[PDB]
């Protein structure tokens, strides 16, 4: 799903890629809901009548309840498509992300794995990177990330990057380290650890 | 009062196969026909077929042709929907919704929708998850700012859900969506955010509750020197 950065207020115009035949909006966690069909039903301040060239939906101005996805249903020999989805964030003031490391607990220690994890806490915009270096060497494909959906409150995103080594790998060496690059850092965060300290 | 009623969760293994049930209230089910959508983890909608509350006469989409049946009850207004020979990439939630009264001119669109049905498609078993502490140190500690949590870890199937003292604790709060690894088992962490003058005389536990499993665990995190 696609993503488009706005305010609360603002004109927005998303195109369907006559094969037409409705707009859904879908909130997440929850099931699409109608918004208009060929019926020609839908006043309000979502209209399909943009132009006679492309299949269009206008929000005449974003509401604080309208922040969701928005896909379009098509027909190809009674055969129907969904078009991708254009997801609205909210737009907001560029924060930096907070950062926080946790070696793995001596329980976990006690049955031969051991996860290190990396918090980048209430950033803004949604894209960051992190990268794990043990003893200075950089690391891909033994650490899995995951991401918060846009607070309802601060309008921020959270991240976890959580790196997976044996017991017997992890015991093996002694720095770890997490290096975070975002919009909102003039240089780069590096969050690190000694194990056994 | 117009709703559609889906049947609840399920897990399958791969060559099984999984039945559905959509029972429609409020509107006459013989006077609309009745479609089925499903949409896998972080991906788009997939239309899997419709049927005709009227007639009972069927339109299933090529790919799903000879593996999906659909049928209707016209006495009890409940509409079925079967998917054989499973395999993982079936995992979804599964949707059915009225679609169009019993000339494609004016198609009125899908306005009712169910609930959905999540079917998860797995060769591993049931697992109730392993509840690590993430201690609050000096390496999450910055200014009076000290992040905590629970590591819950390798289990099967979803969903778990985490709570901090109780429910008293609601703010700060940053339970992870779950990630699946290639051992099947799902793994997530349940992050808090505190005041670090706090961590000497306030009691911080995850309360990590997993039905499938039928696991509960209450741990207490404490903090932990460098």
């Known amino acids: 799903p696609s993503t488009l950065s706005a305010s609360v207020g603002d004109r927005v115009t998303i195109t369907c890629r006559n094969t037409w035949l409705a707009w859904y909006q879908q909130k997440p966690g929850k099931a699409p809901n109608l918004l208009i069909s060929?019926?020609?039903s839908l006043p309000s301040r979502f209209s399909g009548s943009g132009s006679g060239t492309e299949f269009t939906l206008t929000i005449s101005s974003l509401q604080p309840d309208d922040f969701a996805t928005y896909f379009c249903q098509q027909y190809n020999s009674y055969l129907y498509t969904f078009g991708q989805g254009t997801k609205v964030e909210i737009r907001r003031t560029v924060a930096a992300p907070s950062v926080f490391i946790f070696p793995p607990s001596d329980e976990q220690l006690k049955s031969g794995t051991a996860s290190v994890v990396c918090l980048l806490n209430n950033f803004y915009p949604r894209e960051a990177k992190v990268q794990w270096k043990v003893d200075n060497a950089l690391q891909s494909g033994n650490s899995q990330e995951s991401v918060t959906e846009q607070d309802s409150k601060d309008s921020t995103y959270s991240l976890s990057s959580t790196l997976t080594l044996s017991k017997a790998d992890y015991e093996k060496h002694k720095v770890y380290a997490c290096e975070v690059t975002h919009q909102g850092l003039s240089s780069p965060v590096t969050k690190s650890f000694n194990r056994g300290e | 009062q117009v709703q559609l009623v889906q049947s609840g969760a399920e897990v399958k293994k791969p060559g099984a196969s999984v039945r559905v049930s959509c029972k429609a209230s409020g509107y006459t089910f013989t006077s609309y026909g009745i479609s089925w959508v499903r949409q896998a983890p972080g991906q788009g909608l997939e239309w899997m077929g419709w049927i005709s509350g009227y007639d009972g006469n069927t339109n299933y989409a090529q790919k799903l042709q000879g593996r999906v049946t659909m049928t209707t009850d016209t006495s009890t207004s409940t509409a079925y929907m079967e998917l054989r020979s499973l395999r993982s990439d079936d995992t979804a939630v599964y949707y059915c919704?009225?679609?169009?009264?019993?000339?494609?001119?004016?198609?009125?669109?899908?306005?009712?929708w169910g609930q959905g049905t999540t079917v998860t498609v797995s060769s591993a078993s049931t697992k109730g998850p392993s509840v690590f502490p993430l201690a609050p140190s000096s390496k999450s500690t910055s200014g009076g700012t000290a992040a905590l949590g629970c590591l819950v870890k390798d289990y099967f199937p979803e969903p778990v859900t985490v709570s901090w003292n109780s429910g008293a604790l609601t703010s700060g709060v940053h339970t992870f969506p779950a990630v699946l690894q290639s051992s099947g088992l799902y793994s997530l962490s349940s992050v808090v955010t505190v005041p670090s003058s706090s961590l000497g005389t306030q009691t911080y536990i995850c309360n990590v509750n997993h039905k499938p499993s039928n696991t509960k665990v209450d741990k207490k995190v404490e903090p932990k020197s460098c």
């Open positions: 060929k019926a020609s």
């Open positions: 919704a009225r679609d169009g009264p019993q000339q494609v001119y004016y198609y009125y669109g899908m306005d009712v």
